[PDB]
Design a protein around this nucleic acid. Structure first.
Lengths: 128, 130
DNA sequence: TCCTCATGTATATACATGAGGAAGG
DNA sequence: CTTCCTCATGTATATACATGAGGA
């Protein structure tokens, strides 16, 4: 069923990260239950649920076996991101206090917002 | 000038493929003669010129010399226009006959196999939960 | 001949990091 | 001493092209 699949893919990611694992580490560690390793891509597809229902469920089993047996990237939402980009056009170099205010309203950490802004600037300076 | 910059990145990608290297291999071969190994990401940024103008000139000096001493899968890049036609056709008829596929290939100058797989993958994504 | 399917390898994208400079006044 | 930049290039994760095995 979809609801237990969605709920699981959500929590698997939560657990995977808290536990220090990289999509590649996990795909490579599955040989302890599966007899073979899965690729980085595969684990991404499962977490993002970019597979067939049949496929995703099969994996949900393998991966669950592994789990009980067993910077950290911050994903910025498609609401925060295109709303940071809306703050950039206004001013592309907010000062110390404003980046803190933005982190506050977006409940993110001062440092991911800071680095996003620095990165957005590098983008402007690129050739193509 | 930049005109020469733009044309080289382009001809670097074509000569890479026709020789047998992948972006990953360029970074490795570029270690045997240059010392340090560049990631795949860097090689990709270069070809796509997703670098600062200065950076792009530095890399070009390195890559320029290597490519000519390099005279001793095979992914296909599908253009933005090719992709535009492809999905227009998809929406008209999702599963083309072998004649049709062969025609779109001749029309876009791609191998019949590339059009074939492009259709299959496109159908396969719509069978996904998300 | 060609599709479906699971899952891979080649690329492109989003988030990081380290060294080295600016200036508080 | 601190605190936020620029800049070349990094790693972790997302995407696009390809494979091979069986339907049948």
């Amino acid at each position: 069923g979809m609801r237990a699949l969605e709920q699981f893919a959500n929590e698997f990611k939560v657990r995977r990260i808290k536990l220090g694992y990289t999509q590649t580490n996990v795909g490579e560690a599955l040989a302890a239950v599966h007899g073979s390793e899965f690729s980085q891509t595969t684990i991404c597809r499962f977490e993002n649920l970019q597979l067939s229902f049949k496929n995703a469920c099969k994996l949900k089993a393998i991966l669950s076996k592994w789990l009980e047996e067993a910077k950290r990237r911050t994903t910025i939402s498609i609401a925060a991101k295109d709303a940071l980009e809306r703050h950039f056009g206004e001013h592309s170099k907010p000062s110390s206090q404003e980046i803190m205010r933005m982190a506050e309203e977006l409940n993110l950490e001062k440092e991911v917002v800071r680095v996003w802004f620095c990165n957005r600037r590098q983008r402007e300076k690129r050739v193509k």
